Structure formats: C-alpha cells, structure tokens
Swiss-Prot record:
Disulfide links within the chain: none
Species assigned in the record: Escherichia coli (strain K12)
Main function: Specifically methylates the guanine in position 1207 of 16S rRNA in the 30S particle.
One term under GO cellular component: cytosol
Subcellular location: Cytoplasm
Catalysed transformations (reactions): guanosine(1207) in 16S rRNA + S-adenosyl-L-methionine = N(2)-methylguanosine(1207) in 16S rRNA + S-adenosyl-L-homocysteine + H(+)
Record note on what altering residue 225 to A does: Strongly reduces affinity for S-adenosyl-L-methionine. Reduces activity by 87%
A single GO BP: rRNA base methylation
Protein name: Ribosomal RNA small subunit methyltransferase C
Pfam families recorded: MTS, MTS_N
Molecular function terms, GO-annotated: 16S rRNA (guanine(1207)-N(2))-methyltransferase activity; nucleic acid binding; RNA folding chaperone; rRNA (guanine-N2-)-methyltransferase activity
Cofactor requirement: Mg(2+)
Length: 334
C-alpha cells in the first residue's frame, strides 16, 4: 500500500497475519483491503475512501459518521491511521475505543508533523501506548485496550453564530465550517434574488449555501461532500437557518445526478502539485457534465493553484470575476 504510514505497518506484516483487524482513521490508501490478515474490517467517515475499500472488501468496509457495535464486531485488533486534526482523532478514537472489547490490541500510526505524539496522552487512561521504533518522521504506537471510554457523539456537536447565520459543526470539518475569507469573496460575486438550481460541491458545514439562500431565497439547493461530518453538519446548518436543500455524500460528482444552473465551490488548499492538478481536473471536468445550457461554474481558490489552465482546457476560456491578495473567483459558462 502506497502511503508512508502504510509502509510503516508493512514493516510489521508478520504480526498482523493471524489478526482479525479493524482499520480506521485517515484511510488514504487501500492497505486495509490488501494486508494479509485472518480477517479485515474498516470504518471510515470518508465517502471516497469507502468507495475504494468496499469495491474490494464489500460489506467488511463501512461508511458513516459514527461507528457502531456491528461495524466493529469480531475484531481483536485496531489499526488506526492518525488524522491531520486532533478533534477529529479524539472523536474517532473515543467512538471506536468505547465499542471494542477490553483486551483489543491498539496500533496507532501517523506523522509527527500531524501531531501523532498527542495519541499517548489522549489514550493514557484507556489504552496505554508505547512507541515502536519507526522511520524518523513517523510515529508507530502500540498498546492494549484496558478501559473503554464512554462516548456520546452529541456532546461533540458545536454551534455558533457568524454574520447572523447559525452554524452547527462536528470534528472533521476542521477549517471548512466558517465564513472564511475565500467564502466571503465568492459570496460578494453572487447577486441577490438569484434564481435556479445550485449545487455546492465543496460542502463543509454549508455556510456558503445558507448565506447564498439568505439573499436568493428561491435558489434550489443541492450539497455534497465526501466527509460524513460535513454531510451531517450541513443538513443541521440548513435546518438551523430555515433553508431547504438536499445534502448527500459524494466523491465530487460521483453521486450527483442532473444538471444545474450554477455550480459553486471553495475547494481546500492543496499540498503538492499533482494532488492539486488532479483535484482541479476532477472538479472542472465533472462540471461540464452537470450544467444546464448557459449554466455557470464558479470557484474561489488561491491563485497559485492550476485551475486556469484546466478551465481553458475544459471550457475553452474563463474569467476572473473577483480577486484579492490571495484568492481569485473563477467563472466558466456552459
């Protein structure tokens, strides 16, 4: 399996061979489907990861905000891939450890730069962890579950108000649940009393959608995101603001059916160049397939990323309708 975290595990292949493993956390590659095990299961809060894993693992791979007793059954080992954000890791480990049997082996693998060291303290009172020698930038930890924590997902819900808008959010929407500067720029280009079917692809907690609906109450909304927390947060946020709309999980346009008058998105900032290019291609190439005649695709994103070229390639040309010191709002028409 591809990732450095999975390479780490691969260096201890022999130990997982007779194990009945549950894989969870940031399941970036398909090691959960390939690792030689007595049995393998997975639970993820990411739709695209579930797509990949269930293709090979069927019902042994599950997707949902909250893992359940059944999702975890007949597993004597947990291999958890540490996520980038701590509240997400807390939510997931309490959820998972609260259901697995006392005695389950716990393995935690991640990157020091992503805060994997925080796991020790986090699990100190439940499953005492010890570091296993690994590559210098990687953290590999092991321990047995001694005491199950008590978990109640409802206590992790957050709620706040910004610009007269109520926002409900959950761990796992770590910088995409607010009225960020990029969102503000995108919003400034939308005119009041706009009409049509819309579709907000990079979902988040739905702040963009409820702010759009506030001045254009007739728009007909569809929201999608890969993250279960984002799907849950958005529905709650729409409801909390008297806004109707359909929200569902999707790997970009994988579950989107139909055409729209406008597609908007505030993608996350990429990391590399390839990850960035791919993300730009998928968004744009999927867009031409879901736009009514004369419909518009609108994207706000850092100017450094590769959207302009992808835009020209797909639509022939595009416009920069709004700009700041970092962001550009790109517009392309059907």
């Amino acid at each position: 399996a591809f990732t450095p975290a999975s390479e780490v595990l691969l260096r201890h292949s022999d130990d997982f061979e007779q194990s009945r493993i549950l894989f969870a956390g940031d399941l970036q590659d398909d090691l959960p489907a390939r690792l030689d095990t007595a049995a393998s299961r997975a639970h993820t809060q990411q739709f695209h990861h579930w797509q990949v894993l269930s293709r090979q693992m069927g019902d042994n791979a599950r997707f949902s905000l909250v893992a359940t007793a059944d999702d975890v059954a007949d597993c004597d080992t947990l291999i958890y891939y540490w996520p980038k954000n701590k509240p997400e890791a807390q939510f997931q480990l309490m959820n998972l450890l609260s259901l697995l049997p006392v005695g389950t082996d716990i393995f935690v693998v991640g990157e020091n730069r992503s805060g994997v060291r925080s796991a020790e303290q986090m699990l100190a009172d439940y499953a005492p962890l010890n570091k296993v020698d690994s590559a210098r930038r990687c953290g590999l930890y092991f321990g047995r579950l001694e005491k199950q924590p008590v978990f109640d997902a409802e206590k992790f819900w957050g709620e706040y108000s910004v610009d007269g808008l109520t926002v409900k959010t959950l761990p796992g929407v770590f910088s995409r649940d607010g009225l960020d500067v990029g969102s503000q720029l995108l919003l400034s280009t939308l005119t009041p009393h706009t009409k049509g079917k819309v579709l907000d692809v990079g979902c988040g907690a739905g702040v963009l959608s409820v702010a759009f609906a506030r001045h254009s109450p007739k728009i007909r909304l569809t929201l999608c995101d890969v993250s279960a927390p984002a799907v849950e947060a958005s529905r709650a946020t729409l409801a909390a603001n008297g806004v109707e709309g359909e929200v569902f999980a999707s790997n970009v346009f994988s579950e989107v059916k139909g055409r729209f008058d406008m597609i908007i998105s505030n993608p996350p900032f990429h990391d590399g160049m390839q990850t960035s290019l791919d993300a730009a291609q998928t968004l744009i190439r999927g867009a031409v397939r879901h736009l009514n005649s004369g419909g518009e695709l609108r994207i706000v994103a850092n100017a450094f990323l590769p959207y302009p070229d992808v835009l020209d390639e797909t639509f022939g040309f595009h416009e920069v309708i709004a700009q700041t010191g970092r962001f550009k709002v790109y517009r392309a028409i059907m």
